Amino acid sequence: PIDDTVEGITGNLFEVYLKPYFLEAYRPIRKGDIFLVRGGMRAVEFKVVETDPSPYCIVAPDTVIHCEGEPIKREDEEESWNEVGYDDIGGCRKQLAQIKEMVELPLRHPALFKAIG
Amino acid sequence: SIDPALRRFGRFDREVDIGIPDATGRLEILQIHTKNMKLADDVDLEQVANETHGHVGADLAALCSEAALQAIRKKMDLIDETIDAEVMNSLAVTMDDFRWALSQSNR
Amino acid sequence: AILKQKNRPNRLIVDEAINEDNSVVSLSQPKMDELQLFRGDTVLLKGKKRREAVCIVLSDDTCSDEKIRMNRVVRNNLRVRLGDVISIQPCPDVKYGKRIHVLPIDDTVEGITGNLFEVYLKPYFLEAYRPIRKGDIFLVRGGMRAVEFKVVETDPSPYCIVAPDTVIHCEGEPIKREDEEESWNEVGYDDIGGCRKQLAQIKEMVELPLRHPALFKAIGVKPPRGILLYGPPGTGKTLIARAVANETGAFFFLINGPEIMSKLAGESESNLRKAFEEAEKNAPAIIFIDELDAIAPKREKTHGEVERRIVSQLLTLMDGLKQRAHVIVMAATNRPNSIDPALRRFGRFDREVDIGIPDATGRLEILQIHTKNMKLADDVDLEQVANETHGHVGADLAALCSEAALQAIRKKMDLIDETIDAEVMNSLAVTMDDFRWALSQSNR
Amino acid sequence: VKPPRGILLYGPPGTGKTLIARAVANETGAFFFLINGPEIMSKLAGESESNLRKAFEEAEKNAPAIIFIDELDAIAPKREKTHGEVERRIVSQLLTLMDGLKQRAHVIVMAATNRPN
Ligand SMILES: Nc1ncnc2c1ncn2[C@@H]1O[C@H](COP(=O)(O)OP(=O)(O)O)[C@@H](O)[C@H]1O
Ligand SMILES: Nc1ncnc2c1ncn2[C@@H]1O[C@H](COP(=O)(O)OP(=O)(O)O)[C@@H](O)[C@H]1O
Ligand SMILES: NC[C@@H](O)c1ccc(Br)cc1
Ligand code: NA
Numbered sequence: 200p201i202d203d204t205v206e207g208i209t210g211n212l213f214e215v216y217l218k219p220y221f222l223e224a225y226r227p228i229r230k231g232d233i234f235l236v237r238g239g240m241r242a243v244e245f246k247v248v249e250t251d252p253s254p255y256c257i258v259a260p261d262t263v264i265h266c267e268g269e270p271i272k273r274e275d276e277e278e279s280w281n282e283v284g285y286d287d288i289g290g291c292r293k294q295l296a297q298i299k300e301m302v303e304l305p306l307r308h309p310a311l312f313k314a315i316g
Numbered sequence: 317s318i319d320p321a322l323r324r325f326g327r328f329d330r331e332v333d334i335g336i337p338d339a340t341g342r343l344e345i346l347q348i349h350t351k352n353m354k355l356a357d358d359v360d361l362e363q364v365a366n367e368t369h370g371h372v373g374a375d376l377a378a379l380c381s382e383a384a385l386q387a388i389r390k391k392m393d394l395i396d397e398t399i400d401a402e403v404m405n406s407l408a409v410t411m412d413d414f415r416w417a418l419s420q421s422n423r
Numbered sequence: 424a425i426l427k428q429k430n431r432p433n434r435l436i437v438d439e440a441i442n443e444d445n446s447v448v449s450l451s452q453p454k455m456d457e458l459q460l461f462r463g464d465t466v467l468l469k470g471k472k473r474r475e476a477v478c479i480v481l482s483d484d485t486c487s488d489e490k491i492r493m494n495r496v497v498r499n500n501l502r503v504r505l506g507d508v509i510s511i512q513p514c515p516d517v518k519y520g521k522r523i524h525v526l527p528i529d530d531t532v533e534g535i536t537g538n539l540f541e542v543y544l545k546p547y548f549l550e551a552y553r554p555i556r557k558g559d560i561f562l563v564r565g566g567m568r569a570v571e572f573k574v575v576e577t578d579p580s581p582y583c584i585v586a587p588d589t590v591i592h593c594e595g596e597p598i599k600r601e602d603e604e605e606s607w608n609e610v611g612y613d614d615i616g617g618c619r620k621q622l623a624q625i626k627e628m629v630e631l632p633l634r635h636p637a638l639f640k641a642i643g644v645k646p647p648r649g650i651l652l653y654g655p656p657g658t659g660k661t662l663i664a665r666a667v668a669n670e671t672g673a674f675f676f677l678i679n680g681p682e683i684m685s686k687l688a689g690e691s692e693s694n695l696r697k698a699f700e701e702a703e704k705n706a707p708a709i710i711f712i713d714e715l716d717a718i719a720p721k722r723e724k725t726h727g728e729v730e731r732r733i734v735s736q737l738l739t740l741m742d743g744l745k746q747r748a749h750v751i752v753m754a755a756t757n758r759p760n761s762i763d764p765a766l767r768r769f770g771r772f773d774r775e776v777d778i779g780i781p782d783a784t785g786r787l788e789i790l791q792i793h794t795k796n797m798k799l800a801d802d803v804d805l806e807q808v809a810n811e812t813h814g815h816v817g818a819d820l821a822a823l824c825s826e827a828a829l830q831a832i833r834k835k836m837d838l839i840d841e842t843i844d845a846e847v848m849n850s851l852a853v854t855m856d857d858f859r860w861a862l863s864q865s866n867r
Numbered sequence: 868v869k870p871p872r873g874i875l876l877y878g879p880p881g882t883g884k885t886l887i888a889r890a891v892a893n894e895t896g897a898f899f900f901l902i903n904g905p906e907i908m909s910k911l912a913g914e915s916e917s918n919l920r921k922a923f924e925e926a927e928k929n930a931p932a933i934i935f936i937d938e939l940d941a942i943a944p945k946r947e948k949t950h951g952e953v954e955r956r957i958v959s960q961l962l963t964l965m966d967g968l969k970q971r972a973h974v975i976v977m978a979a980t981n982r983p984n
């Protein structure tokens with residue numbers, strides 16, 4: 200688990216979050232993946248630190264899931280827990296599209312504006 | 317109400333109207349603010365969206381919190397340091413909980 | 424290997440009294456049948472911190488099966504709040520007491536002189552066969568005040584029935600109110616009349632954040648942060664806020680609008696910030712802002728930059744309140760269209776409750792509340808008083824009751840003319856003529 | 868039971884409001900402390916508030932006492948008719964002192980105005 204995302208939770212996280220997430224879903228996963236699971240009026244994050252076979256596999260009914268060890272530090276990883284994104288915004292598609300266009304070049308391609316007047 | 321000199325060329329050069337959502341937008345907002353909740357089969361978020369004319373996103377977010385807290389209050393009685401994940405993950409918010417929230421008049 | 428049942432039928436949720444007597448608890452009739460209890464039976468109640476109480480159980484046709492009605496004296500003796508759980512069992516083996524020892528609680532008898540036993544204890548126990556337990560604190564009303572006593576021993580021990588033959592001993596060092604958990608001069612929901620529905624709404628709003636604060640480090644859902652109470656002056660807005668703090672066990676910090684605004688520039692803002700920090704440090708807490716409009720009028724009605732700075736400071740402090748766990752801000756105004764609308768934004772004052780003027784039934788309840796320490800003559804007709812006080816608010820009715828009592832005293836200070844005597848005060852009756860005199864004055 | 872704490876006397880100038888307050892103090896043997904509105908408001912910022920507070924403390928120290936505020940409206944007009952933050956501070960100070968009056972045993976405040984509205 201990623202430490203900040205399980206603070207204030209107690210109990211069996213595996214049974215509550217990981218089992219339903221993977222159950223008969225045959226999810227493909229890769230070593231180094233960070234994934235988000237929702238339930239219980241919160242969201243928790245986990246990191247895939249190893250797989251066998253390596254470095255990716257399908258999590259199948261026979262797959263054993265190990266969860267023992269030192270929790271991951273959220274500051275050491277790139278993830279979106281509790282960060283708002285466009286997926287958190289409903290019912291103003293056209294206004295958001297306008298704003299996206301307005302900021303695309305200055306925020307995503309800033310070097311452009313030392314080339315052009 | 318703001319100082320019109322703020323709209324001069326090179327200051328606030330663009331304006332965008334973020335209005336009130338329509339029924340389809342309200343449904344999307346309700347789906348966003350329940351995505352971490354367990355909703356019972358009888359929850360009809362489309363009905364909630366249809367009857368919340370004029371509400372904005374903050375109103376809908378407050379409604380969803382109110383419904384979830386009502387659900388908890390109803391099932392804190394039969395249970396009464398750190399809360400347990402299995403308890404929280406099996407609690408379902410029901411249509412009755414949304415109906416209770418929609419029937420309060422103090423917001 | 425070493426266990427026992429968990430969902431026990433004798434675990435009940437604590438609910439408010441309908442019968443305000445210290446010795447009585449009420450159950451539903453089906454629950455009494457399930458537990459094989461009968462009207463008048465003595466029962467043993469178990470609460471928190473291994474506290475116990477002995478009471479007489481009666482049936483009540485409005486009690487939910489899973490709840491028990493008990494007054495605030497019994498709740499304190501059991502160390503429970505409304506909404507907590509107790510257990511109840513039959514207590515058939517209670518004997519008539521040979522002797523008991525009781526002591527007064529010091530603060531509650533200050534300024535009284537005379538024989539407290541004869542004035543308070545004798546009428547309280549007389550032919551009532553009250554069950555009592557060692558360690559009980561109980562409240563007795565009369566003489567236009569309330570006094571408190573502690574049961575420090577009983578024989579047999581640790582509980583008995585106080586019967587006509589029981590000897591009551593009262594000699595020794597008075598009990599220190601600070602060493603005990605009791606409700607003397609603390610306002611509760613039993614001190615509030617004529618706004619049952621509004622109080623029920625507020626109770627629901629604060630239940631989880633003030634009573635179950637750990638919940639909100641488990642879940643991402645947001646509770647109410649600010650509750651605005653609207654209504655004319657004197658409708659009990661401060662009373663409600665205080666009562667909710669007391670009944671939930673929350674720290675209570677009062678901010679009074681004029682007091683903040685009497686300060687110099689800068690000191691007003693420091694005092695607001697200090698209030699929120701003290702509340703956070705003692706959370707769960709309620710901050711109550713009395714006369715909010717003195718601090719936070721609409722920008723139209725501000726004629727100064729120091730006044731605008733103070734409103735802005737309050738807005739910023741409300742915004743910080745999410746970072747302050749288990750703190751609820753309640754605020755009161757009688758000019759709701761007068762306060763700054765930015766106060767109603769999501770995450771500031773998110774809820775509003777209209778505390779209106781009471782109706783005739785509510786006025787009667789208020790009159791009963793404000794006469795509960797008085798001796799009322801047989802001819803006092805509080806229903807008549809309630810019927811004729813249309814438009815009055817709680818403060819008006821409280822003033823009326825004081826005025827009637829002082830008129831009664833003036834009429835019987837003449838025929839008598841350092842410390843007043845309990846027997847004099849406890850035998851003085853307020854009469855209908857005294858209420859009629861009060862109702863006929865026009866100078867309030 | 869609570870006695871009256873403050874008594875407002877209303878009437879045109881010269882109808883005996885000060886006379887009444889003085890006479891009640893003398894006939895009851897109460898200490899009498901006069902606060903005159905214009906005199907308070909002639910003081911610098913801060914001195915007005917200190918003088919109000921000092922009046923209530925002296926009355927409490929000599930109780931039973933009557934504080935009489937002559938020309939109350941010079942100190943405590945409606946917020947409409949205040950054109951300054953020092954004037955609003957002074958009204959607020961008086962409100963706070965009245966609220967403290969329950970903690971000051973046997974002190975009655977009488978006040979007079981010819982503009983009660
Ligand atoms: N609903 C009520 N029940 C009992 N007493 C009340 C009620 N409302 C007001 N009072 C009495 O009026 C007085 C002032 O009430 P307060 O809470 O200060 O009113 P507000 O804050 O609304 O101005 C108190 O003595 C209080 O007991
Ligand atoms: N009712 C009265 N009886 C006798 N003299 C009065 C009366 N009312 C006013 N006066 C006289 O008028 C003068 C001023 O009265 P004062 O008490 O200052 O009035 P106010 O305070 O109402 O302005 C005093 O000399 C006082 O004796
Ligand atoms: N001094 C008190 C002592 O006489 C006494 C002890 C116990 C009991 Br029960 C009553 C009285
Ligand atoms: Na991170």
Ligand code: NA
Pocket residue numbers: 600601602603604605
């Ligand atoms: Na105490």
